[PDB]
Structure formats: structure tokens, C-alpha cells
Amino acid sequence: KLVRLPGLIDVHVHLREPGGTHKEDFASGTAAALAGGITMVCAMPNTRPPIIDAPALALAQKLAEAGARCDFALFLGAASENAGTLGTVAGSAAGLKLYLNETFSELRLDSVVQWMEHFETWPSHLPIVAHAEQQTVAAVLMVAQLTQRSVHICHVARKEEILLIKAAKARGLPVTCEVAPHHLFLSHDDLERLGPGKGEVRPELGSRQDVEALWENMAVIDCFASDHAPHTLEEKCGSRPPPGFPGLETMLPLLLTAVSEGRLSLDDLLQRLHHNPRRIFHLPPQEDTYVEVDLEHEWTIPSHMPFSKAHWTPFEGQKVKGTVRRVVLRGEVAYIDGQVLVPPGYGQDVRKWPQGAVPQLP
Amino acid sequence: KLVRLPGLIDVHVHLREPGGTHKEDFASGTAAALAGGITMVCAMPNTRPPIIDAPALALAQKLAEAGARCDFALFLGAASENAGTLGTVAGSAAGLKLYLNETFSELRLDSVVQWMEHFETWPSHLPIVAHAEQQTVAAVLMVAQLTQRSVHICHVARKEEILLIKAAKARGLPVTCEVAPHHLFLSHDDLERLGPGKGEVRPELGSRQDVEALWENMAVIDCFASDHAPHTLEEKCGSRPPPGFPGLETMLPLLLTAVSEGRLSLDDLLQRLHHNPRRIFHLPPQEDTYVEVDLEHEWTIPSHMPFSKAHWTPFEGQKVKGTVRRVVLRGEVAYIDGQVLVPPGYGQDVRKWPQGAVPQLP
Ligand code: NA
Ligand code: NA
Ligand SMILES: [Zn+2]
Ligand SMILES: [Zn+2]
Ligand SMILES: [Zn+2]
Ligand SMILES: [Zn+2]
Ligand SMILES: [Zn+2]
Ligand SMILES: [Zn+2]
Ligand SMILES: [Zn+2]
Ligand SMILES: [Zn+2]
């Protein structure tokens, strides 16, 4: 007895191409997406070169069109130099990404004034998402209000953050957010097992009280999104571990387990992995696209999932119930029981579809 | 030819009593105030014990009444435990101080939710001031808007901060701010002379561009306030230098020098050291109180000013023009040409005066 789900959308993935293709590329990362029941991904701009200008976006578009196996949109990244220069290409992107905490030299912003400049110059009808932790959530919300527009908060990871967003929504402010599976299914209690290298992630793993607060405030969470952030095991366990977890292949099984346990409903899941991603990012439908899952199959997550080049997972050893059996993408069988059946290049840039443009006033 | 000024008000001083009296006490710190032409001070709550509860405020009130030589009001400090407990004593304080960056364990807040709780529980008609640097300015402004009240930003030190506040004022938001003299008259260029211990201050010294931005945006600065933060030279130059500069004795001479050079007007100075402090904090007039200054006297700041127990100054070697000749406080000569003539205990808590209560609806 399989359950048919719509094509699920992950609005936060790092596919590492260009420039980091030993960690992941479009072909491997979108294989991982399909195996996770995800038929559309929005890829972040912190590649090498970073997607911070029209030439880099043009390159990334061709790499994605040639390598992706599922459909996609590409984010642009905000830099210290590019505010006011992205207007001609802005509508071709998923949205604009602001990295407001750590970051590489090219996506680093050193002043809130630079944030304001981006909010003032990026077209007001197009999405803006932010990596904004702790007080940075409040700070970017202030910039959004000063510029009288919306903002979407990436990977909310803490009680403090979800409660701040809840208070802002109670005041009618235009803010949405997403939560990643590691902030719902891992905590400080897992750091001994993971160790300090594997355990490195931003936002960091929270306390049990953080995790419980996210679940209790499910109504405040608009989307789930993986923050799939692959790095090899050698990198994670070496002298300067980079932050991030792979997550495309584990997200849906973890969440289906929670549905099976009554922690959220199937509808709650589908709002957060399909309907709300569509409406916040104005992402188009995918014709003849669906995912068949077996909700009864119990399995234990292994030391690596089959497709991501990360070749490791922080969820190793967790018992899950639910698995992706088949994915159909735009009328073609894309995945069956561990086999990807669409080639690199099958996927398309949804922003080029007539229905994938973000509506705007003339 | 002396110029008569009104009694000037410094809304940000650290007088170190109780608990740090080798650095300063009420008697020495208020001698320094009078010698700087300051007749009223608002004392911060990061003492030992910190002024975070009614018993500590009661102690501090008696120490100040016995030791102060000029008039004063005492801030309460926000803690992780005291939101909703200060209502009976709130109106007796200068206001509530939030330390939103560094801090000692007792004034440290670990979550923006704790800031919200303070803004929700502190009486809405009473002042709130914050140590809030860089993005923390935007974050606390967001909390103020969510709770629909005002906030005052302490020691604005950077271009980024003054421009953010300027943008908030252009949107009609109820925010005021102050600037300390070291952020107008010192910069990174002075760090070689000061060295890394003496140079430690929070907010840190800014670049030349930061200093220039504060001067260019004088219209955005509501108050000047010293952040007089005395520590001994041994402490400043030892193994863990604490942040802060003494400043009561140098503030007015530095600013009078700037007036003499046409960098701001006498009126600009008096708005920022008298009228705006009064109106933001609802501080009462001082009857028969005035300061006589000699605007022609040129002198060089020495290695220590006469009164602060800090016994050092970062402004050593600067040439100034303008000096305090005489101060009259409530009809008594309080200071003449280097001699303080009112004893410890002459000063009074202005919040106990009938005219010093903050007006409120029944
Ligand atoms: Na393609
Ligand atoms: Na007294
Ligand atoms: Zn992020
Ligand atoms: Zn995101
Ligand atoms: Zn990310
Ligand atoms: Zn549906
Ligand atoms: Zn401060
Ligand atoms: Zn202050
Ligand atoms: Zn201070
Ligand atoms: Zn006047």
C-alpha cells in the first residue's frame, strides 16, 4: 500500500558545483534529491566562483542544465559589492541569499547598512532569504521592516529564534521560516557520538530544549529544508572541519517516521515540503510529477547514503519508518528502489518556464 | 569673559561603588563630574553587588546619598532572573539598562526572548537604555517595535550604527542615542600610542571613517554621555585589561575645543548635554545651578586628571581650549579652579524630588 505524494521541494541545498565537485556535483546532489523524494531544489550561491554576479550565474545555469537530474532554481548571493547591480538577472534566480553570520570573504557583509542596501535595491517582489542566527534574526527583521518588505529565515535552530519569529507573526509582520531535519532529530546529546568534526554545523546542534521548542512551535514553521551541505568524511574529520551535514537522502524518511509516530500529520509535512515552498518562492508546479512512499518499511540509517558524495551521515544508526519507492518527474520514471533512471541534464531551470516567473507589477 | 552654561547632565557613568571603590567611588567620581562641569549623573548598575534587585538598589541609594557631591539617578540593570520583579522600584531608578553584548554573569542575557520579557514587563513610561553594538542595535530596535515602545542606544561608536539609527528616525521610530567623547576624538590612529591595554574599550575605538561619520551625522546624536568607566592604570596594563576609559573630567573641555573650532555650536552642545538628557530621561531641573567656563584658555591634557581614581587618561597630550572655572549647585559653590567645595553627601537622588518622578497615566 503506497502513498502518493506530490513532487517535494527543498528550498535550501548546497550542490557544490562549480568548484567543490569532490563534495557533490549537480548530478550527484540531484540523484540524492530524487532518492529522498525531492523533485525540485533551490541551490545556494556559496560555490567557487560564488554566484554573486551575472557571469557566475550564467556559468552555474549551464552547469546545472547539463548536470541536474531534477528541476532547480539557483539563488544569487549578496556581496559587499553587488547591491544595485543584479536587477537584470534578479528574476532569473530563486531569490537573493544573505549570509549574515560567518561566510567566505565574498559573501561576507560587514555592516547592517549593506543589508539595508540589498533590501532597498533587490526587486521588492522577489524572495530574500537569510542565514541569520540568534539576535541576527531580530536584526534582519528590523531591516525588512525599515524597507517595508518580507524576509524568509533559513534553518531556524533554537527556541530563542522560533519564539522571536512567533512574536513577529503575531504582530502581522511578513516573515516566513524553514527548519532543517538535524535541528528536529539531533541535539547536543548526539555530539559525543558524532565527535567534534562531524558535529560541526551552522547553525549548531541545539539543546534538547531547543529541539522540543521547534516541535512545540510547528505551527510557526513554514517549510522544511535540508541545508544539504556535503563535505567528505576526510574534510569533516581533518584539521579544520567545515560546517555542514548532507541531508537530501535522509530528510523525508526522518519526517515520515515522525508522521508515523503522530508527531505531525501528513498534511503538516506536505504544507512544509510542497505547498509553502511553492507559495513563498513562487515556484511553479511540475506536471505529471509525484513520489510513491512505503510508510511501513522499517530500516536503520547506514554509515553513508547511496548517492551524496559526502559519503557519511550524522543520522547513522537512527531507526526510521518510511521509504521512497518511486519518483516520477514530468512523466518519466526518475527513481525506483535505489536506482536513478533519469540522466544528468534531465532537470530544468524552473525560472525559465513561463509559469515559473515571479509575478510583478509593470 | 566667562560663559554661563546650565547644569550639565551625564546620563552614562560608572562610579564603581559598591564593590570597586579602588577604581572610583561616589565621592571621587562626582568630584570628577563637577570638575567637568557636570552637575547631575546617571550611574550604571554593573557594580558589586550589581543593581539588579530592590535590596541592591536600596544599598546603592544610601551609598550615593552619603558619598555623592553632585545630584544623581541610579539605573537598574536587567538580568536573566529579574524581568517582572522590578515594578515596585522601577520609578525610583534612572531607567533600566540592558547589557546586550559582553557583560558579567549577572547582567548577561542569553536570548532575545529575555530582552522581549524586559520590554514587556518594565513600565512602558520609564526609560530603557541599551549597550547594543553593530547588529545588536537593529536587533534591540526590533524588540522595541514588537513591544511598541521607545529605546535609547548607548555610546554609538560606528558609521554603521549612526546610519542605522538615522534610517530608523527617518521612519518615525522612537529611538534616541548618545555618543561618548572617545568615539569623537580618538580612533584607530591612537592605538599605537595607547597600547593594547589602555586602548581596551567597549565599544572599541573606531576608524577615521567611523569618527567622521559621527561628526557628519551630528543631527542624529541626541546626547553626549561620557561612559566614564574608570579602572586603575595597573588594571588597564595588566594581564587581562578591563575595557573602559575615565571621561568625566575631559568630556566638556574636548567638546568646548570643538565648539571653538566651529565643529558644532554652543547650542548643539547644550542640547546634547542638558536639554535632551532632561527630556529623554525626564530628569528635573536643578534650581540655582550653573557652570562658568573660560573659552579662551589653552591647555594640554596631562597624564591623569586631578579627581578620578583611575589616575590615567587616554586623551593625554591632546591640546584643548576651554576650561571649567566655577560650578554652583543648588545655590552653593561646588567647584572653583580645581577645588571641590561641596562635601560627600551634598548630592541628592533626583528621582526622590517631586519634580523628578516620571509622569504616568493612573
Ligand atoms: Na537540462
Ligand atoms: Na545626600
Ligand atoms: Zn545557512
Ligand atoms: Zn534557507
Ligand atoms: Zn546553507
Ligand atoms: Zn496538497
Ligand atoms: Zn556600555
Ligand atoms: Zn548610555
Ligand atoms: Zn557603560
Ligand atoms: Zn537652554
XYZ file of C-alpha atoms and ligand atoms in Angstrom:
734
model
C 0.000 0.000 0.000
C 1.963 3.002 -1.290
C 1.076 6.621 -0.588
C 1.276 9.091 -3.451
C 2.805 12.413 -2.535
C 3.323 15.429 -4.797
C 6.767 16.432 -6.013
C 8.524 17.731 -2.922
C 10.625 20.909 -2.946
C 13.808 21.576 -0.954
C 14.475 25.314 -0.887
C 17.933 25.029 0.709
C 20.639 22.822 -0.795
C 24.372 23.212 -1.452
C 25.290 21.276 -4.592
C 28.977 22.388 -4.648
C 29.249 22.876 -8.420
C 31.105 24.903 -9.555
C 34.311 24.473 -7.630
C 33.708 21.828 -4.979
C 32.741 18.847 -7.054
C 34.571 16.259 -4.915
C 31.970 17.067 -2.234
C 28.941 16.885 -4.544
C 28.004 17.990 -8.050
C 24.688 18.735 -9.701
C 24.426 15.151 -10.942
C 25.131 13.506 -7.583
C 23.272 16.007 -5.449
C 20.143 15.770 -7.590
C 20.378 11.973 -7.544
C 20.359 12.309 -3.756
C 17.345 14.632 -4.010
C 15.344 12.175 -6.117
C 16.222 9.311 -3.777
C 14.872 11.500 -0.969
C 11.600 12.143 -2.776
C 12.608 15.681 -3.775
C 11.854 16.734 -7.341
C 12.870 20.400 -7.152
C 15.781 22.039 -5.356
C 16.930 25.621 -4.794
C 20.724 25.736 -4.819
C 22.719 28.123 -2.700
C 25.317 30.526 -4.166
C 28.397 29.852 -1.993
C 30.166 27.926 -4.740
C 33.604 28.621 -6.303
C 33.192 31.034 -8.042
C 30.299 32.239 -5.863
C 27.070 33.139 -7.662
C 27.312 36.870 -6.977
C 27.304 38.332 -10.500
C 25.779 37.740 -13.909
C 28.778 35.860 -15.376
C 28.855 33.417 -12.458
C 25.096 32.867 -12.671
C 25.408 32.189 -16.406
C 28.071 29.568 -15.741
C 26.086 27.953 -12.924
C 22.949 27.831 -15.105
C 24.736 25.857 -17.807
C 26.380 23.502 -15.308
C 23.010 22.864 -13.696
C 21.182 22.397 -17.001
C 23.792 19.804 -18.022
C 24.129 18.040 -14.683
C 20.857 18.229 -12.776
C 18.540 15.219 -12.778
C 15.678 17.014 -11.027
C 14.400 20.543 -11.565
C 16.002 23.507 -9.862
C 16.308 27.211 -9.274
C 19.586 28.954 -8.453
C 19.976 31.564 -5.726
C 22.048 34.707 -6.189
C 24.238 35.724 -3.250
C 24.546 39.176 -1.721
C 28.078 40.574 -1.546
C 29.738 43.733 -0.292
C 29.972 44.945 -3.897
C 26.889 43.820 -5.793
C 23.915 45.713 -4.325
C 22.231 47.568 -7.161
C 23.921 45.513 -9.886
C 21.684 42.426 -10.014
C 18.496 43.942 -11.422
C 18.771 42.496 -14.920
C 19.278 38.911 -13.679
C 17.357 39.008 -10.376
C 14.155 37.490 -11.751
C 16.032 34.510 -13.168
C 17.180 33.442 -9.684
C 15.403 31.542 -6.928
C 15.929 34.652 -4.799
C 18.708 36.551 -3.037
C 20.648 34.869 -0.225
C 22.148 36.933 2.584
C 24.856 35.240 4.697
C 24.668 37.366 7.837
C 26.841 35.313 10.205
C 30.183 33.530 9.314
C 30.724 33.298 5.493
C 33.515 33.335 2.907
C 35.187 36.640 2.065
C 32.955 37.100 -1.000
C 29.538 36.660 0.722
C 30.613 38.369 3.946
C 28.784 41.575 4.822
C 30.490 43.747 7.419
C 27.708 46.234 8.144
C 23.943 46.279 8.607
C 23.989 49.200 6.147
C 24.994 46.714 3.453
C 21.986 44.612 4.395
C 19.765 47.678 4.023
C 21.281 48.424 0.614
C 20.402 44.922 -0.571
C 16.835 45.179 0.764
C 16.494 48.597 -0.943
C 17.880 47.533 -4.355
C 16.805 43.902 -4.850
C 13.406 43.919 -6.624
C 10.760 44.085 -3.933
C 8.632 41.241 -5.362
C 11.485 38.716 -5.352
C 12.453 36.456 -2.446
C 15.134 37.264 0.094
C 16.356 34.540 2.446
C 18.895 34.886 5.221
C 21.322 32.821 7.246
C 20.542 34.732 10.450
C 21.139 33.182 13.846
C 20.100 34.355 17.326
C 19.989 38.153 17.532
C 20.687 38.313 13.784
C 17.084 37.147 13.245
C 15.820 40.231 15.060
C 18.336 42.456 13.269
C 17.364 41.305 9.776
C 13.665 41.569 10.670
C 14.325 45.189 11.599
C 15.960 45.833 8.223
C 12.999 44.197 6.492
C 10.573 46.483 8.348
C 12.636 49.618 7.612
C 12.498 48.704 3.911
C 8.808 47.532 4.179
C 9.185 44.078 2.715
C 9.259 40.393 3.613
C 12.111 38.116 4.619
C 12.493 34.348 4.946
C 14.695 32.971 7.740
C 16.768 29.916 6.867
C 17.232 26.892 9.174
C 15.712 28.053 12.435
C 17.518 26.028 15.075
C 16.780 27.447 18.519
C 13.940 28.105 20.925
C 15.049 31.760 21.017
C 14.684 32.085 17.245
C 11.342 30.316 16.783
C 9.807 32.334 19.629
C 11.072 35.610 18.133
C 9.556 34.666 14.780
C 6.329 33.628 16.502
C 6.123 37.062 18.151
C 6.755 38.778 14.813
C 3.990 36.748 13.150
C 1.626 37.678 15.991
C 2.320 41.329 15.078
C 1.400 40.616 11.435
C 4.911 41.038 10.082
C 5.770 39.405 6.739
C 8.278 36.781 7.840
C 8.442 33.097 6.996
C 10.943 30.450 8.032
C 12.205 26.932 7.496
C 13.662 24.248 9.761
C 16.214 21.586 8.827
C 15.944 17.971 9.930
C 19.077 17.939 12.028
C 17.528 20.612 14.285
C 14.479 18.381 14.816
C 16.189 14.982 15.126
C 19.666 15.650 16.588
C 20.787 17.638 19.617
C 23.689 18.160 21.999
C 23.037 14.585 23.144
C 24.477 13.375 19.817
C 27.764 15.286 19.961
C 29.645 12.548 21.835
C 28.801 10.015 19.118
C 29.418 12.393 16.221
C 32.600 13.899 17.634
C 33.697 17.498 17.195
C 34.485 17.352 13.482
C 31.429 15.539 12.175
C 29.335 17.535 14.633
C 30.352 20.893 13.132
C 27.278 22.555 11.577
C 25.891 26.084 11.335
C 23.526 26.702 12.972
C 24.995 24.366 15.555
C 23.068 21.497 17.097
C 20.748 22.713 19.812
C 19.870 21.548 23.271
C 17.008 19.158 23.970
C 15.017 22.259 24.943
C 15.728 23.826 21.538
C 14.545 20.712 19.721
C 11.423 20.457 21.874
C 10.635 24.130 21.241
C 10.758 23.655 17.465
C 8.348 20.699 17.658
C 6.025 22.535 20.051
C 6.034 25.527 17.660
C 5.447 23.522 14.489
C 2.656 25.934 13.583
C 5.298 28.690 13.221
C 7.463 26.639 10.813
C 6.508 27.371 7.195
C 8.892 24.974 5.419
C 11.256 22.113 5.988
C 14.505 22.428 4.055
C 17.565 20.228 4.373
C 20.513 22.671 4.249
C 22.188 19.777 2.464
C 25.809 20.821 2.978
C 28.023 17.965 1.847
C 31.694 17.651 2.689
C 33.764 14.479 2.594
C 34.489 12.491 5.730
C 38.187 13.395 5.388
C 37.238 17.073 5.454
C 34.814 16.688 8.361
C 37.411 14.802 10.434
C 40.550 16.759 9.482
C 42.353 19.704 10.965
C 39.748 22.404 10.143
C 36.360 20.731 9.842
C 33.959 22.710 7.635
C 30.391 23.032 8.916
C 27.516 21.132 7.412
C 25.653 17.879 7.061
C 24.401 16.048 3.949
C 20.648 15.660 4.248
C 18.719 15.150 0.997
C 18.564 11.359 1.312
C 17.548 11.335 4.995
C 15.098 14.262 5.280
C 11.912 12.601 4.099
C 12.492 9.247 5.879
C 13.090 11.071 9.170
C 9.920 13.143 8.737
C 7.822 10.134 7.648
C 8.938 8.405 10.846
C 7.617 11.371 12.811
C 4.324 11.258 10.885
C 4.009 7.536 11.675
C 4.505 8.355 15.371
C 1.845 11.079 15.311
C 4.296 13.937 15.904
C 2.906 15.807 12.896
C 0.364 14.904 10.235
C 0.870 14.013 6.582
C -0.761 17.331 5.720
C 1.648 19.158 8.038
C 4.520 17.557 6.119
C 3.071 18.395 2.705
C 2.476 22.021 3.596
C 6.116 22.284 4.643
C 7.717 20.330 1.755
C 5.397 21.313 -1.113
C 2.708 23.975 -0.747
C 4.547 26.574 1.316
C 7.811 26.311 -0.684
C 5.724 26.911 -3.802
C 3.990 29.972 -2.416
C 6.901 31.685 -0.657
C 9.257 31.340 -3.617
C 6.603 31.401 -6.372
C 7.903 28.100 -7.675
C 5.802 26.531 -10.418
C 4.040 23.180 -10.419
C 5.745 20.220 -12.027
C 3.359 18.447 -14.394
C 2.970 14.671 -14.062
C 5.262 14.532 -11.026
C 4.789 12.502 -7.875
C 6.515 10.402 -5.224
C 5.393 6.977 -4.001
C 6.379 6.094 -0.419
C 6.039 2.907 1.640
C 5.147 4.014 5.151
C 5.555 0.588 6.747
C 9.181 -0.205 5.911
C 11.432 -0.066 8.979
C 15.161 0.429 8.421
C 18.245 1.828 10.139
C 20.200 4.661 8.567
C 23.629 3.310 7.479
C 27.036 4.977 7.688
C 26.510 6.624 4.268
C 23.534 7.009 1.959
C 23.964 5.755 -1.634
C 24.191 8.982 -3.650
C 25.692 12.020 -1.919
C 29.417 12.314 -2.483
C 29.706 13.330 1.170
C 29.762 9.559 1.801
C 28.814 9.955 5.505
C 25.739 10.937 7.529
C 25.159 12.251 11.069
C 21.953 10.252 11.297
C 23.752 6.899 11.153
C 22.113 4.431 13.495
C 18.719 6.112 13.732
C 15.734 3.819 13.163
C 13.267 5.175 10.618
C 9.974 4.016 9.194
C 9.083 5.116 5.670
C 10.971 4.954 2.422
C 10.830 6.360 -1.078
C 9.891 3.638 -3.577
C 9.344 5.509 -6.851
C 9.602 9.035 -8.205
C 8.051 10.196 -11.490
C 9.295 13.550 -12.789
C 7.464 15.207 -15.697
C 6.154 11.865 -16.921
C 9.393 9.851 -16.709
C 10.378 7.341 -14.037
C 13.198 9.116 -12.231
C 13.893 6.749 -9.322
C 12.893 3.225 -8.287
C 14.113 1.396 -5.182
C 17.624 2.780 -5.194
C 18.134 3.233 -8.937
C 18.105 6.671 -10.521
C 16.717 6.394 -14.052
C 16.988 9.937 -15.438
C 20.394 11.130 -16.670
C 22.361 14.251 -15.772
C 20.733 17.045 -17.723
C 17.130 15.847 -17.414
C 16.468 18.609 -14.912
C 15.476 22.128 -15.900
C 15.655 25.674 -14.520
C 12.112 26.329 -13.338
C 12.629 30.101 -13.544
C 12.749 29.768 -17.352
C 9.316 28.159 -17.503
C 6.532 30.646 -18.335
C 4.739 29.628 -15.124
C 7.966 29.990 -13.114
C 8.412 33.742 -13.367
C 7.560 35.654 -10.199
C 4.549 37.901 -10.943
C 5.174 41.640 -10.723
C 3.515 44.958 -11.434
C 4.607 46.561 -14.739
C 34.861 86.851 29.893
C 33.200 83.702 31.256
C 30.266 81.935 29.627
C 27.452 80.733 31.857
C 26.140 77.306 30.994
C 23.315 75.409 32.697
C 23.987 72.410 34.911
C 25.131 69.704 32.522
C 23.887 66.111 32.754
C 25.871 62.939 32.015
C 23.459 60.047 31.525
C 26.158 57.347 31.421
C 28.725 56.998 34.203
C 30.224 54.071 36.128
C 31.000 55.186 39.678
C 32.158 51.724 40.908
C 30.528 51.895 44.351
C 29.596 49.420 45.711
C 32.390 46.942 45.240
C 35.037 48.596 43.084
C 35.966 51.595 45.150
C 39.705 51.483 44.361
C 38.685 52.431 40.802
C 36.302 55.237 41.801
C 33.649 55.872 44.437
C 30.662 58.183 44.559
C 32.739 60.886 46.240
C 35.616 60.795 43.750
C 33.526 60.209 40.659
C 31.194 63.093 41.476
C 34.185 65.326 42.212
C 35.342 64.438 38.700
C 31.860 65.264 37.379
C 31.820 68.711 38.992
C 35.323 69.452 37.713
C 33.998 68.559 34.257
C 31.052 70.930 34.558
C 28.577 68.104 35.201
C 26.040 68.646 37.969
C 23.918 65.516 37.512
C 24.951 61.965 36.671
C 23.105 58.721 35.941
C 25.080 55.810 37.363
C 25.174 52.410 35.751
C 24.242 49.199 37.621
C 27.243 46.925 36.922
C 28.622 47.324 40.432
C 29.393 44.589 43.015
C 26.708 43.678 44.003
C 25.042 44.683 40.719
C 21.931 46.857 40.981
C 19.523 44.176 39.772
C 17.104 43.891 42.706
C 15.437 46.030 45.342
C 17.933 45.246 48.141
C 20.900 46.213 45.961
C 19.180 49.419 44.845
C 18.460 50.295 48.482
C 22.127 49.848 49.350
C 23.309 51.852 46.339
C 20.870 54.676 47.168
C 22.313 55.085 50.654
C 25.912 54.898 49.426
C 25.155 57.537 46.813
C 23.268 59.805 49.218
C 26.254 59.685 51.595
C 29.011 59.949 49.006
C 27.797 61.935 46.012
C 28.788 65.588 45.692
C 26.536 66.272 42.702
C 22.993 65.080 42.071
C 22.284 61.684 40.585
C 19.895 58.989 39.492
C 20.686 55.273 39.657
C 19.964 52.824 36.849
C 18.566 49.355 37.476
C 20.101 46.532 35.440
C 18.254 43.826 33.538
C 19.201 40.257 34.448
C 18.209 36.774 33.356
C 16.078 36.481 36.501
C 14.527 39.852 37.274
C 12.035 40.609 34.482
C 8.663 41.206 36.092
C 10.105 41.742 39.577
C 11.150 45.408 39.415
C 7.746 47.087 39.225
C 7.669 48.437 42.772
C 11.097 50.115 42.484
C 11.214 50.893 38.744
C 10.088 54.508 39.070
C 12.816 55.256 41.603
C 15.548 54.443 39.060
C 17.034 56.484 36.234
C 15.788 53.723 33.930
C 16.542 50.111 33.024
C 19.915 49.217 31.500
C 20.240 46.269 29.133
C 23.778 44.933 28.534
C 23.259 43.151 25.222
C 26.870 42.399 24.257
C 29.697 41.191 26.643
C 28.735 41.627 30.361
C 29.262 39.981 33.752
C 27.382 36.777 34.544
C 24.671 38.714 36.410
C 23.780 41.243 33.644
C 24.294 38.763 30.806
C 21.221 37.934 28.741
C 21.498 34.801 26.624
C 18.387 35.171 24.471
C 16.471 37.879 22.631
C 13.386 36.432 24.355
C 14.789 37.751 27.632
C 15.075 41.172 26.031
C 11.425 40.953 24.980
C 10.416 39.961 28.512
C 12.117 43.064 29.896
C 10.477 45.331 27.299
C 7.090 43.721 28.103
C 7.366 43.980 31.917
C 9.315 47.187 32.624
C 6.782 50.045 32.961
C 6.221 51.434 29.492
C 6.656 55.099 30.511
C 10.109 54.567 32.029
C 13.421 54.752 30.160
C 15.230 51.767 28.709
C 18.819 52.159 27.523
C 20.986 49.531 25.889
C 24.617 48.659 25.332
C 23.960 47.445 21.779
C 26.719 47.368 19.197
C 26.577 46.767 15.431
C 23.747 44.396 14.512
C 22.604 44.451 18.152
C 21.309 47.991 17.504
C 18.988 46.645 14.820
C 18.023 43.669 16.987
C 17.046 45.764 20.007
C 15.164 48.206 17.761
C 13.160 45.237 16.506
C 12.304 44.215 20.071
C 11.265 47.791 20.832
C 8.923 47.817 17.820
C 7.425 44.409 18.693
C 6.648 45.766 22.173
C 5.612 49.228 20.759
C 7.858 51.411 22.859
C 10.997 53.538 22.740
C 14.637 52.668 23.308
C 17.792 54.721 23.837
C 21.072 53.440 22.372
C 24.167 53.991 24.498
C 27.550 55.149 23.123
C 27.072 54.957 19.378
C 30.565 54.413 18.022
C 30.389 53.437 14.357
C 29.247 54.710 10.985
C 27.148 51.534 10.654
C 25.292 52.286 13.887
C 24.620 56.001 13.377
C 23.336 55.350 9.848
C 21.011 52.588 11.086
C 19.634 54.934 13.738
C 19.296 57.701 11.152
C 17.228 55.369 8.952
C 15.037 54.409 11.913
C 14.425 58.076 12.757
C 13.503 58.740 9.119
C 10.803 56.061 9.546
C 9.470 57.866 12.643
C 10.563 55.212 15.111
C 11.004 56.215 18.770
C 14.752 55.806 19.185
C 17.286 58.182 20.683
C 21.023 57.804 21.159
C 24.147 59.196 22.758
C 27.803 59.401 21.732
C 30.841 59.353 24.022
C 33.816 61.657 23.573
C 36.337 58.948 22.846
C 34.333 57.997 19.728
C 34.540 61.605 18.509
C 38.137 62.432 19.484
C 40.082 59.135 19.336
C 40.339 56.479 16.642
C 42.425 53.539 15.468
C 45.177 56.096 14.832
C 45.623 56.392 18.617
C 46.039 52.685 19.370
C 49.819 52.678 18.868
C 50.240 55.417 21.482
C 47.709 53.967 23.915
C 48.846 50.366 23.550
C 46.583 47.333 23.706
C 45.732 47.510 27.404
C 44.932 51.191 27.776
C 43.214 51.044 24.394
C 40.691 48.416 25.529
C 37.184 49.944 25.490
C 33.692 48.782 24.550
C 32.551 49.863 22.063
C 36.072 49.780 20.689
C 37.748 52.770 19.087
C 36.587 53.242 15.527
C 38.278 54.013 12.265
C 38.768 57.553 10.992
C 35.722 56.894 8.798
C 33.659 55.982 11.876
C 34.667 59.181 13.650
C 33.960 61.292 10.569
C 30.541 59.659 10.183
C 29.549 60.556 13.747
C 30.521 64.208 13.206
C 28.773 64.346 9.827
C 25.641 62.869 11.460
C 25.635 65.162 14.487
C 21.964 65.882 13.828
C 21.205 62.213 14.646
C 23.021 62.334 18.019
C 20.596 63.240 20.817
C 23.029 63.302 23.761
C 26.677 63.249 24.650
C 27.489 60.965 27.567
C 30.927 60.014 28.823
C 30.660 56.271 29.597
C 33.074 57.183 32.373
C 34.461 53.711 33.073
C 37.386 54.075 35.450
C 39.941 51.371 36.116
C 43.412 51.857 37.555
C 46.472 52.009 35.336
C 47.686 48.725 36.868
C 44.435 47.082 35.785
C 44.490 48.616 32.304
C 48.098 47.494 31.734
C 47.988 44.069 33.421
C 47.321 40.573 32.213
C 43.567 40.956 31.494
C 42.859 44.614 30.802
C 39.238 45.555 31.549
C 37.529 47.791 28.990
C 36.820 51.428 29.625
C 38.110 54.959 29.837
C 37.633 57.629 32.529
C 35.987 60.634 30.922
C 34.099 62.995 33.248
C 36.973 65.468 33.592
C 37.816 65.575 29.867
C 34.392 65.496 28.158
C 33.456 69.156 28.340
C 36.952 70.533 27.549
C 37.145 68.327 24.449
C 33.699 69.462 23.278
C 34.402 73.147 24.029
C 37.504 72.831 21.854
C 35.298 71.576 19.033
C 32.863 74.466 19.571
C 35.776 76.927 19.412
C 36.818 75.363 16.088
C 33.302 75.634 14.651
C 32.720 71.869 14.511
C 29.432 72.267 16.385
C 27.725 75.230 18.016
C 27.300 76.082 21.689
C 23.601 75.348 21.259
C 24.414 71.959 19.722
C 26.463 71.175 22.834
C 23.765 72.347 25.243
C 21.057 70.322 23.551
C 23.239 67.236 23.915
C 24.494 67.805 27.496
C 21.417 69.440 29.056
C 18.091 69.693 27.232
C 17.921 66.285 25.573
C 19.150 64.370 28.662
C 16.392 66.118 30.606
C 13.671 65.218 28.140
C 14.636 61.626 27.320
C 15.071 60.617 30.957
C 12.545 63.068 32.456
C 15.240 64.432 34.727
C 14.242 67.504 36.720
C 15.791 70.957 36.669
C 18.338 71.857 39.308
C 17.477 75.203 40.887
C 20.219 77.838 41.125
C 22.712 75.658 39.250
C 25.155 76.733 36.576
C 28.665 76.295 35.194
C 31.077 79.093 34.283
C 33.619 78.266 31.557
C 36.593 80.176 30.136
C 36.593 79.502 26.409
C 39.981 81.088 25.733
C 42.241 79.027 27.996
C 44.515 76.694 26.024
C 45.970 73.686 27.838
C 47.249 70.172 27.178
C 45.604 67.188 28.825
C 48.080 65.676 31.345
C 48.770 62.024 32.129
C 45.966 61.990 34.742
C 43.188 64.395 35.656
C 43.016 65.524 39.311
C 39.967 63.666 40.644
C 39.158 60.291 39.080
C 40.759 57.415 40.935
C 41.524 55.889 37.537
C 44.618 58.133 37.670
C 45.191 57.918 33.875
C 43.535 59.230 30.704
C 43.560 58.185 27.030
C 43.393 61.819 25.984
C 46.835 62.632 27.398
C 48.667 65.006 25.103
C 45.644 66.436 23.311
C 45.520 70.237 23.127
C 42.203 71.684 24.270
C 40.741 75.148 24.541
C 38.109 75.756 27.211
C 38.045 75.035 30.901
C 35.602 74.881 33.775
C 36.194 77.771 36.190
C 33.266 77.585 38.622
C 30.257 75.393 39.309
C 27.309 76.412 41.504
C 24.988 73.581 42.541
C 21.657 74.427 44.199
C 22.988 77.758 45.428
C 26.346 76.574 46.815
C 29.765 76.949 45.210
C 30.651 73.378 44.302
C 33.894 73.835 42.348
C 36.377 76.640 41.672
C 39.577 76.326 39.639
C 40.452 72.817 40.713
C 38.988 72.825 44.225
C 35.802 70.947 45.030
C 33.930 72.804 47.770
C 30.903 70.597 48.489
C 31.406 67.509 50.668
C 30.477 63.884 50.022
C 26.763 63.680 50.678
C 25.811 67.086 49.265
C 24.317 65.369 46.241
C 20.768 64.052 46.128
C 18.725 61.410 44.296
C 16.743 63.434 41.775
C 14.122 60.682 41.471
C 13.010 61.495 45.038
C 12.285 65.120 44.182
C 8.590 65.775 43.443
C 9.578 67.183 40.037
C 11.820 64.170 39.353
C 9.157 61.493 39.068
C 8.446 60.338 35.522
C 4.840 61.299 34.662
C 2.461 58.410 34.017
C -1.198 57.670 33.440
C -3.041 56.432 36.562
Na 18.568 20.192 -18.534
Na 22.920 63.446 50.033
Zn 22.897 28.749 6.260
Zn 17.347 28.520 3.580
Zn 23.017 26.628 3.722
Zn -1.873 19.325 -1.487
Zn 28.159 50.251 27.557
Zn 24.297 55.042 27.957
Zn 28.863 51.972 30.296
Zn 18.799 76.221 27.033
